[PDB]
């Protein structure tokens, strides 16, 4: 007539660490560290991502004729750049505050690419066909950006121009333009010994006295165009005017608000799934509150830790005998 | 105490609970998990791990930042931030898990001890104690005398 009191053990091998002893063999343990990813540049939540392919944010926003597919995109949950994303600006030039632009383009899938100064409804006596180069070659032949519009002097006389745009679409409008810095070709292309561009707004506030120089050629180009941008609010008005070297806009982007996202640099292929968290190496589950996969993440993500394993004990001392 | 102590072995053949009993009435023998303490323990461990997970309040955030060639100071600052919280969450995770691992093992240990003492509270004069944590009955015990003690209802001492 005996009765014993005892505890559990099983043929387990999981070992957890404690503050007073190491590699304690425990009957069960739960790991709190997500360390598996499996490359799949997932479409987190619902919105499929955006792959820029051989293009970057520059060539996508400017409308580089190399970057034509991306014109379709009205939405994306997040933006993907690749190691081949070099088709940025064919005619070379300083995209000023390019990092600030990229940061701003980090909020939602609000696109509307819509036209403000149509190619032939708003420019009399102004050459709207000499936009061309051996730089923006659409497979060899000369061409120019799909969201900007060049203006010339009818080859011998540059008139004056000022078209103002008011905001009516009821969201924030990303506006893009450029200033062309060509006298061998200033006196020839736009004919004036004195030009200026002037971009005025309630929030953007500046002019530009264009520059003359024999800049080392890129894509067989010696003069270049500086590519500028700004954000216009509801109701407010942007105003352009120039006696020369306005690389005029052609159609711009009306964004909005809602669910913000991020931008990435990775070389995997998009597949079909979901996730709350995405890395440059692949998706993972936001159930365990820790990762050691990659520091750059996007979404409702676990914390990145430098740890290798986070064995947390649930059972007890595994003592078979 | 109990775990890795005087109860110097677990029971592999016991696979229906963490804490429990062996009976040896001369009517049969076997293992039997004490379900009350096991339910309580599982509730505790679950609230524990679940609390470790849930109190990690997360939101939507991207870590990437582009700084150009003339913003190295602010690049290294943004590192100082990211690496800072790297070190902090690494440290809190490591120590939290060490601490609560020990605390869990002592949780099981103290539960087993409270079961042993719980039955000792009932079998005072009707049992010798055997240092392997097991009771001998100084009377004749049937196939229900082994049950009255399991449900905390043992009769006259």
């Amino acid at each position, epitope marked *: 007539d005996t009765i014993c009191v005892g505890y*559990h053990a*099983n043929n*387990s091998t999981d070992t957890v660490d404690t503050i007073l002893e190491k590699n304690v063999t425990v*009957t*069960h343990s*739960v790991n709190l560290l997500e360390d598996s990813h499996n490359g799949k540049l997932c479409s987190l939540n619902g919105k499929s991502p955006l792959q820029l392919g051989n293009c970057n944010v520059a060539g996508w926003i400017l409308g580089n004729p190399e970057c034509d597919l991306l014109l379709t995109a009205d939405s994306w949950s997040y933006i993907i750049e690749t190691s081949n994303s070099k088709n940025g600006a064919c005619y070379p030039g300083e995209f000023t505050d390019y990092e600030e632009l990229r940061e701003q383009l980090s909020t939602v899938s609000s696109f509307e690419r819509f036209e403000i100064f149509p190619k032939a409804t708003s420019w009399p006596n102004h050459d709207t066909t000499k936009g061309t180069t051996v730089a923006c070659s659409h497979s060899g032949a000369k061409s120019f950006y799909r969201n900007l519009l060049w203006i010339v002097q009818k080859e011998n006389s540059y008139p004056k121009l000022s078209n103002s745009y008011t905001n009516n679409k009821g969201k924030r409008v990303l506006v893009i333009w450029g200033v062309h810095h060509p006298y061998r070709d200033q006196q020839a292309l736009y004919r004036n010994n004195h030009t200026y561009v002037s971009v005025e707004s309630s929030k953007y506030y500046q002019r530009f006295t264009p520059e003359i120089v024999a800049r080392p050629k890129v894509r067989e180009q010696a003069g270049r165009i500086n590519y500028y941008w700004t954000l216009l609010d509801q109701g407010d008005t942007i105003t352009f005017e120039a006696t020369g070297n306005l690389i005029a806009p052609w159609h711009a982007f009306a964004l909005k608000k809602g669910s913000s996202s991020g931008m990435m640099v990775s070389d995997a292929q998009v597949h079909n799934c*979901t996730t*709350k968290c995405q890395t440059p190496h692949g998706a993972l*589950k*936001s*159930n365990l509150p820790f990762q050691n996969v990659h520091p750059i993440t996007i979404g409702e993500c676990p914390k990145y830790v430098k740890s290798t394993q986070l064995r947390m004990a*649930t*059972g007890l001392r595994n003592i078979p005998s | 105490g109990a775990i890795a102590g005087f109860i110097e072995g677990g029971w592999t053949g016991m*696979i*229906d*609970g*963490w804490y429990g009993y062996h009976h040896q009435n001369e009517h*049969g023998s*076997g293992y*039997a*998990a004490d*379900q009350k303490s*096991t*339910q309580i323990a*599982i*509730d505790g*461990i*679950r*609230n524990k791990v*679940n609390s470790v997970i849930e109190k990690m309040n997360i939101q939507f955030t991207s870590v990437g930042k582009e700084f150009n060639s003339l913003e190295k100071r602010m690049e290294n600052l943004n590192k100082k931030v990211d690496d800072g919280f790297l070190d902090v969450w690494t440290y809190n995770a490591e120590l939290l898990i060490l601490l609560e691992n020990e605390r869990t093992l002592d949780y099981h240990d103290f539960n087993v001890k409270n079961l042993y003492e719980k039955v000792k509270s009932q079998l005072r004069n009707n049992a010798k104690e055997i240092g392997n944590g097991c009771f001998e009955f100084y009377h004749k015990c049937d196939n229900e005398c082994m049950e009255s003690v399991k449900n905390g209802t043992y009769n006259y001492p």
Partner: antibody
Amino acid sequence: QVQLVESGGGVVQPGRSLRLSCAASGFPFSSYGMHWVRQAPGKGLEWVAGVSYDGSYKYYADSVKGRFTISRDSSKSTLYLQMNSLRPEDTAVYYCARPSAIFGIYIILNGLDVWGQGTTVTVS
Amino acid sequence: EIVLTQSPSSVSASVGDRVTITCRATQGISSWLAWYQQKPGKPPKLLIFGASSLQSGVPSRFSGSGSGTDFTLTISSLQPEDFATYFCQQAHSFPLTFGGGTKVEIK
């Protein structure tokens, strides 16, 4: 891979006996306790029976105590639901069901992971 | 016994709605609650065990909550295949108790 097969559901008259069975596949059957849960046709799920891993401790519903009998076979890895004294109140779509396993132990008293296809017991 | 009371007994909704269900008993059943999906003529599939733990392979849009007294099953973004009848389970102690059923119809 892992699933449970059910059988024994047939048309029967009140007062007599039947035997239903659930054969396990893909998991250590004899390590788990098991359950029979009946979906009374029209009503929701109604737990009727359950057994430990060894078969020494057996748990029944008050409606069927002393009237049905559960058992299990390790050599055949099969679950036996032996019904006696049938009556149309026992008319139900029978399910064999597996209580879930938790951290290290295969507890009998938990939510149910795997179900059978559902074998229908009709009593006219 | 312990008596479960699912509310509401039924509900219709479109795809994308925030669906809320309750499971509600008498005793202290801590977190021993199991939510089950059901399609007509089909056996259940364990959705939520431990009253919050998501079952393996079940989408992250299924969520459970409640503790001891008040229990809740929340579904964030309903999908067409999710049209079903839902049952909660008591597992604190025998006998095992189930609910009256909470079905989701088409709106």
